[PDB]
Amino acid sequence: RPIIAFMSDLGTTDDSVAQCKGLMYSICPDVTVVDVCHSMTPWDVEEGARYIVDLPRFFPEGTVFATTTYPATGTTTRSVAVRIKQAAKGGARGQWAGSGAGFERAEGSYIYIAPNNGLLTTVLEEHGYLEAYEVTSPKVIPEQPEPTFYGREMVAIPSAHLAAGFPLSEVGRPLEDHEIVRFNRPAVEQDGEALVGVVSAIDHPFGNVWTNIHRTDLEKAGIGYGARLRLTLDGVLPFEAPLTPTFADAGEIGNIAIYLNSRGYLSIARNAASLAYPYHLKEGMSARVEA
Amino acid sequence: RPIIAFMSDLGTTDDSVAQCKGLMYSICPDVTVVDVCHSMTPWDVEEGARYIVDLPRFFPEGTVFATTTYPATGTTTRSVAVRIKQAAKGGARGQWAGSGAGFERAEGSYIYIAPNNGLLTTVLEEHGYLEAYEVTSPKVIPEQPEPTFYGREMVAIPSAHLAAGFPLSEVGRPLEDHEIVRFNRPAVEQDGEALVGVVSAIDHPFGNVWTNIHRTDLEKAGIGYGARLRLTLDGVLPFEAPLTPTFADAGEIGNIAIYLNSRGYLSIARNAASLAYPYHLKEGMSARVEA
Amino acid sequence: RPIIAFMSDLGTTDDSVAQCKGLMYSICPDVTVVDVCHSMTPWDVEEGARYIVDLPRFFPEGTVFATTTYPATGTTTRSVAVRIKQAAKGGARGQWAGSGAGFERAEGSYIYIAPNNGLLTTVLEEHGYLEAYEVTSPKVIPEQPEPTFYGREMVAIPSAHLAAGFPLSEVGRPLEDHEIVRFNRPAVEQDGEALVGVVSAIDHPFGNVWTNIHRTDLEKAGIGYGARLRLTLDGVLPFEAPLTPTFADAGEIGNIAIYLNSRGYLSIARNAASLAYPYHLKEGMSARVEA
Amino acid sequence: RPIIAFMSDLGTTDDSVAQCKGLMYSICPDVTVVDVCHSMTPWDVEEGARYIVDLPRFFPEGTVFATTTYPATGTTTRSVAVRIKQAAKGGARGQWAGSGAGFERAEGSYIYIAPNNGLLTTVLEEHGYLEAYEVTSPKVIPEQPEPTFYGREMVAIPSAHLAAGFPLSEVGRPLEDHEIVRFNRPAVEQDGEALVGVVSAIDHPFGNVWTNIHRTDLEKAGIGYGARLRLTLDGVLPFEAPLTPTFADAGEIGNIAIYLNSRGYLSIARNAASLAYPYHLKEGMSARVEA
Amino acid sequence: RPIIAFMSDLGTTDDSVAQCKGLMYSICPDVTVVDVCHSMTPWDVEEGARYIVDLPRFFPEGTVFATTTYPATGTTTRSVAVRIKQAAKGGARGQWAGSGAGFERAEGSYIYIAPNNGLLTTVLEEHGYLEAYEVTSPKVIPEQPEPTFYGREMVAIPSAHLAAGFPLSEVGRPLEDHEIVRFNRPAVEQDGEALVGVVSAIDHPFGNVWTNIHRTDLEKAGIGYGARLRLTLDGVLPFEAPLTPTFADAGEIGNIAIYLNSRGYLSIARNAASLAYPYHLKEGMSARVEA
Amino acid sequence: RPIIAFMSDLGTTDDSVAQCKGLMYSICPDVTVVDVCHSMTPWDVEEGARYIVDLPRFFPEGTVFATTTYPATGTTTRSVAVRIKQAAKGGARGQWAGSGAGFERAEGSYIYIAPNNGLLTTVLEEHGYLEAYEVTSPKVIPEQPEPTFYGREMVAIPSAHLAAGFPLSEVGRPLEDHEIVRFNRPAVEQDGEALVGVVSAIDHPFGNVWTNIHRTDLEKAGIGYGARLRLTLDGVLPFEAPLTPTFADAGEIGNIAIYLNSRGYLSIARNAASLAYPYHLKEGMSARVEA
Numbered sequence A, B, C, D, E, F: 001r002p003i004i005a006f007m008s009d010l011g012t013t014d015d016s017v018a019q020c021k022g023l024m025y026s027i028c029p030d031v032t033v034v035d036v037c038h039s040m041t042p043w044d045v046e047e048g049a050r051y052i053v054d055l056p057r058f059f060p061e062g063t064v065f066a067t068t069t070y071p072a073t074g075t076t077t078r079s080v081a082v083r084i085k086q087a088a089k090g091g092a093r094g095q096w097a098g099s100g101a102g103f104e105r106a107e108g109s110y111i112y113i114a115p116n117n118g119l120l121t122t123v124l125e126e127h128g129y130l131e132a133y134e135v136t137s138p139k140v141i142p143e144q145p146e147p148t149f150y151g152r153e154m155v156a157i158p159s160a161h162l163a164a165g166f167p168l169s170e171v172g173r174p175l176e177d178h179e180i181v182r183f184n185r186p187a188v189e190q191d192g193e194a195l196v197g198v199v200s201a202i203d204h205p206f207g208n209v210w211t212n213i214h215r216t217d218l219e220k221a222g223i224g225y226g227a228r229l230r231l232t233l234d235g236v237l238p239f240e241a242p243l244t245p246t247f248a249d250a251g252e253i254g255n256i257a258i259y260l261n262s263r264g265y266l267s268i269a270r271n272a273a274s275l276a277y278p279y280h281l282k283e284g285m286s287a288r289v290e291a
């Protein structure tokens, strides 16, 4: 049965990920380990959060998410293990993933285990949670953990025990909500008739530009598909296009497309060409949209 | 038991491949998903084709190849699913892969699913095909596909249904041969006694240079192992060596080797040193060979 | 539930690794193939050695390590397959990986198969071995091996037979110890009271700097945690810090940490910042430490 | 007090320019040699033309302009020496450089000597000429000219004779107008109401962007200072600002200024910040402007 | 007689400097124009200041310094022309430049003309001044100055009139001290027994590192030649060497030298090797020195 | 009348060259200072030598060459001043430079002043010398020279005294031939019928490749214009062309030209395209030529 989906900042150029995987198979012989990605900017908890927030709906119920960037490795800190509530960001207008009308996922069906450093901020915000525990029991972590490798000791190892059916509530004491570290999410400001945000990510390998201006932020301004937009990046680049569902709607190869990405965020790209790379556009640059 | 071998342009820096994998495991619980590669130049159909053309003889019979670069994502286009004819000859490369005399593969034993954009051109050229269908049935694709993610909606998802035993002929209507998009492959030309082609790829991470001039094109010119060759690249950057089976035949480390790569194409390298990188050699550069 | 742990210099940008995996599943249908890494500097046998030496204690007993950089591909050379003795770097007390007191591994529980080019030098040094054989039998390698792809022919293929239960002693004749190629490891020398070694690796993606100076070399010079050290790199760039167990011990983000890495070697880093990248520090640079 | 103003593509990293200067002082002992620049893109005759076209009005009457990029060096080609007619780009009213109302320059007061390769195209277009001669006399060029250094042999040397008072008409035979090589200057075209030109130069070291769109092209489309413009570069990157006389008119540091450069062409910049460098803007990129 | 020494941010890749020089020769036919440098970081008034502060002692009395970075070009601002008082930074213990005991320079013997933007801050601080005037008279600037080229209109042109003997006090009205724009010079902090400053410049082309910690700051701490220093750059690099007069005092090529540069500022270098380049050290990095 | 031609490693990015010039004009009021170049690789005596060896025949008789890279600055070393013998033959290059039959220069007509570090090795080799003196007299150098600026103190300053007519023999004691430091010049070797040398320089800004294989070395091998040559660079990167007088003889733009440069050395280029830059060719690479 069991699946662990594994996301880290460990990279793919040495044996760090393999050591974690070896231990997952040692503990839970029948496990399937699925890599999410291992390439996140080291120590960038906000970036790590983006790669793990929308996973549950895509995976079978009972999947465990081992998600780790651990700059506090070797300190007295301990990981948090949480059972999430709802698999969607939606649920009302479902938008389940899969063929047909998609695969509906039951509530309380996924566990995340992570450093208690805010990595799970958006997971908890979008999904809610039913229970959360500090990971302390020597049944699921080493008695003598390697100081420089808590991703392995405090995330990979216990994730496999959880996958093998170790009761969640036995990993350690319950954590009160305020004991779960969170980062602040800069809010999209409803300025004038415009919405002012940032570039949240460059979408590699395509060089598409993703903003933190969500479809729900747009709905709030009556902005829908077909609306002629001005999207200004870095303060000085007033891109102009209608909001369209996809890249090819821009027509000629290389033409600008303003669109909603697969997370429902306002994005901008060229049609089958890279927008970000030629002009060295970067995450953190300002993004303003108006109709 | 069932395997899906997965090749895309999605990269390995975010959760895109993982969303596809989650759904593959959801649809076909027993499946093994094997990554081919996810690093191809985005939208480069010809490059993608080289990563998938010679896979079948390496894989167990019944393997499904989910192969996708999807620049027409979100348009009315639909994927093609094809059952190939021969696993080897035309893509023999000796003949069968494996220990002893190799593993003979029965005809009609492999399915590819891909955008209908020419990605399968060389697969069909080298292997032939027995049947081909448009992928349209809501039993195997979403009713509301994400406009910007047809790699997931129109390839990953239906590949998993096929792996799970969904009948190939039920995915949609049969496609006539002319309805399968193909790209043109530039021909190897004869100019005097010399064969003129191009650098087809730089072989990373080694910096070996691979041309589109084939063993069969050399055999047609009376050229075999031992022949003293002059291989000019970029019109001006020439090289001279005998055609040898392997790198070490060049003698000293760094010496030039002209050889046949594992696909039987005329190639050039330095012995345990990078040829392409120090001189910034690139794909698309002209390549002329003469005896 | 057989496992093959697979380390190569083949990269992950083409189908080379996938060809190997396909053949592994062909030969041993119930196998799990775990990637160690495929990104090592091509032909660098010393670097490859570092990624494979400490794997056994993390993996279930019976795991086969297919480990290959093969610059002598297509020559009369043949691979070596060895069953190692001790899984840990320790004798009694062991230092075992996993939850609780870790998971002890029985002696003789792991097989490595590799080119006979010195890649296994440190594996043999740290673990010892019980038996070693030349890999020559056409039951486990191709009768007509592709000259430029011995990593596939002479490592991937036979590793899958071994995973499948093919008897190790039947792959070919026993090799005497002197017939197993070794590289020499450069000694940490003494310059008065200063220890003199090299930078053995830049620890990507973090930019931590690992030296070949071991805890044991430090102890003989009178150094444990808390000792004020001067660490000079490249005979130019000086750093000073106490030896601490981990990064956050340095205090402020960006502060210098001098520590022992997860393999017990003297290393240097910035706390949650890259040391190596801004100063363009590289492997092979001299490293001198003194109390 | 003769002056030679000297512009070449010879660079300033070796002794090439110094060899030319030595010979200038040898031939015309009282000369002052003024460097224009020596950094032009080698062999780019259009670029060289831009650095020399507006020089005469700044210089004392009788100045000789030695201007040379000479890719046809060592061929049977010979230089052209011309006495220009009008010093300014203007007729009556002139637009003279200097303090007060500027310094008027008499007609026929300046000589250019250059390869006959089109380098003087715009000088002749903007200034007209009174007389033109092929440079062939052994009184003013070497009898045995260095084949790879015609910039020295056929430009520097004869320019110094001319500065010294050698009669222009004696350097060789008169050239008819059709015998003076010209390049064609690409026309600013019309796309509806938008003007369409190119980026003619990146203005180093500031990263300002100069277009080939002239004030006169703008006037015919109904545009003077204060006009709100949309300027699109490279068919991708859009900017919007009023046309202003100078950089600081943009307000804040970093703000976009669209202005007319000191040669009267439509240009774009950031105020006391580089525009071109962060976005990697280059010469030859399309430039479209509309009111 | 007259000399103009010319320093600007105009670069040496186009005709901007030449246009200024042409006009200088037009106005003052007997002038010698000496380039200081034209390569300063555009708009960086503090950097420009460093290239012009120590010039007077090296030049004949009566020399005019035309010094210009003019980001306020085209505004209502006007240049300042000042007669400096003392040619030295010293005078007491002379340290005149030249052979023998050097060339003593009379007081009031040099004029600077510059934008009134703080470029002359250090000139006025180190030398004092006797008179200062706003440059407004149409006898010495154009009646219709080119908006984008005040370096030419408001500095080069009037500098030549001044060189030709135009009375300084006739350029325009006297400026009161408070009307002369100045920048703040971050002070070297006498912390503990240490002195905390910054890297003021990387000394190209050598890659030596210059600090703003002056010889007089060192004298204040009893630091002289022979003192064993710890110089920490960027917070984390405790360089250690005695203060020595020159590079070769460090011994072996590549060894660290801590020294006083030719302006009397604490500097650090390698002996006949670049310190700054290999480790990408930069201006603005912190610099702390202690004995 | 008097000229100083000035070559250094001081660069053109700060006021170092200008301080030298100021003093030259102070000491010798009538002087003209001609820049050779200031861009040489710092401390590279062999490179500096190439920029100064062939200057004399270009300059008026009585010219002083102030040539300095001074890594031993601030040591007890003292400069050497030498009067050379022959201006040309041995450095003829045809013979005399200039119009007609060129300008014959009398023997003993040029003085070089330089660090005694081998910078003048090839000057003395090609021109011979009549007298040489150590530069020690306080009449021509400072009594208290700046330790880090001997380029100024021990070259610039005394060069100006020499230009001003200070007797050469009064600068200090005569130096015996053995007291003049020389560097070793690697010899062009014969290997079979082929001549083996090195790339002596990349000819910036063109990317031409210059070797140390001379016209005389070719003339000794029976090689003249028209000879079909094979020129291999970096041991592996070979090229084939006839020896031609100039670039355009190669025909099409971009075609390979093998030719003799203006110093008579075997060189290779592309016709009006850069050879060195696209392929990252560098000085010090091996160069072998055969007919």
Ligand SMILES: Nc1ncnc2c1ncn2[C@@H]1O[C@H](CF)[C@@H](O)[C@H]1O
Residues within 6 Å of the ligand: A009, A010, A042, A043, A068, A069, A070, A071, A072, A073, A148, A149, A150, A151, A152, C206, C208, C247, C248, C269, C270, C271, C272, C273
């Ligand atoms: N230099 C570092 N500073 C802080 N944390 C680091 C550093 N290098 C690696 N790490 C963290 O170690 C964890 C291993 F468990 C990884 O997740 C890194 O974030």
Ligand SMILES: Nc1ncnc2c1ncn2[C@@H]1O[C@H](CF)[C@@H](O)[C@H]1O
Residues within 6 Å of the ligand: A206, A208, A247, A248, A269, A270, A271, A272, A273, A274, B009, B010, B042, B043, B068, B069, B070, B071, B072, B073, B148, B149, B150, B151, B152
């Ligand atoms: N900017 C883009 N233009 C056209 N297609 C794109 C672009 N960015 C991503 N894609 C395609 O989306 C598919 C997801 F399924 C990927 O295969 C990309 O080819």
Ligand SMILES: Nc1ncnc2c1ncn2[C@@H]1O[C@H](CF)[C@@H](O)[C@H]1O
Residues within 6 Å of the ligand: B206, B208, B247, B248, B269, B270, B271, B272, B273, C009, C010, C042, C043, C068, C069, C070, C071, C072, C073, C148, C149, C150, C151, C152
């Ligand atoms: N250019 C090369 N020289 C020597 N060995 C090479 C070269 N390119 C690839 N290889 C080796 O081929 C093996 C394939 F099995 C890889 O492991 C490479 O080390």
Ligand SMILES: Nc1ncnc2c1ncn2[C@@H]1O[C@H](CF)[C@@H](O)[C@H]1O
Residues within 6 Å of the ligand: D206, D208, D247, D248, D269, D270, D271, D272, D273, E009, E010, E042, E043, E068, E069, E070, E071, E072, E073, E148, E149, E150, E151, E152
């Ligand atoms: N983009 C610019 N913003 C502000 N000033 C600039 C810009 N580009 C050039 N300049 C200034 O123009 C002056 C010419 F007189 C130069 O000194 C530049 O500083």
Ligand SMILES: Nc1ncnc2c1ncn2[C@@H]1O[C@H](CF)[C@@H](O)[C@H]1O
Residues within 6 Å of the ligand: E206, E208, E247, E248, E269, E270, E271, E272, E273, E274, F009, F010, F042, F043, F068, F069, F070, F071, F072, F073, F148, F149, F150, F151, F152
């Ligand atoms: N870091 C340096 N080591 C040795 N010599 C140097 C260094 N930096 C500059 N110089 C020499 O100082 C001379 C000034 F006259 C220059 O010619 C440099 O060669």
Ligand SMILES: Nc1ncnc2c1ncn2[C@@H]1O[C@H](CF)[C@@H](O)[C@H]1O
Residues within 6 Å of the ligand: D009, D010, D042, D043, D068, D069, D070, D071, D072, D073, D148, D149, D150, D151, D152, F206, F208, F247, F248, F269, F270, F271, F272, F273
């Ligand atoms: N490789 C070259 N091809 C054509 N012309 C060249 C090349 N290298 C230098 N030159 C020209 O030589 C002239 C010397 F007078 C320079 O102006 C270059 O344009």
